[PDB]
Structure 1
Amino acid sequence: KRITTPYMTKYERARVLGTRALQIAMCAPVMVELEGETDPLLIAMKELKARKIPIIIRRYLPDGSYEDWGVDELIITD
Structure 2
Amino acid sequence: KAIPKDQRATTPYMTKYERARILGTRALQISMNAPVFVDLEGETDPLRIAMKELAEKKIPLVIRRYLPDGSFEDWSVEELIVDL
Compute the TM-score of the two structures, normalised by the length of structure 2: 0.80
RMSD of Structure 2 on Structure 1 (CA): 1.4
- Structure 2: 5+ residue stretches without partners: 1-6
Q: Where has structure 1 moved over 2 Å in runs of 4 or more?
A: none
Show the counterpart of 1:39.
Answer: 45
> Unpaired segments of 5 or more residues in structure 1?
none
Worse overlay, 20-29 or 35-44: 35-44
Once the two structures are superposed, residues 21-44 of structure 1 have per-residue CA deviations (whole angstroms, 9 ceiling, x without a partner) of 011111211221222221121122
**Corresponding residue for 1:27?**
33
Q: Higher RCO, 1 or 2 (CA under 8 Å, sep at least 6)?
A: 2
- Same amino acid, percent of matched pairs: 76
Residue 7 of structure 1 is matched in structure 2 by 13
Structure 1 position 63, deviation (Å):
2.4
Partner residue in 1 for 2:56 = 50
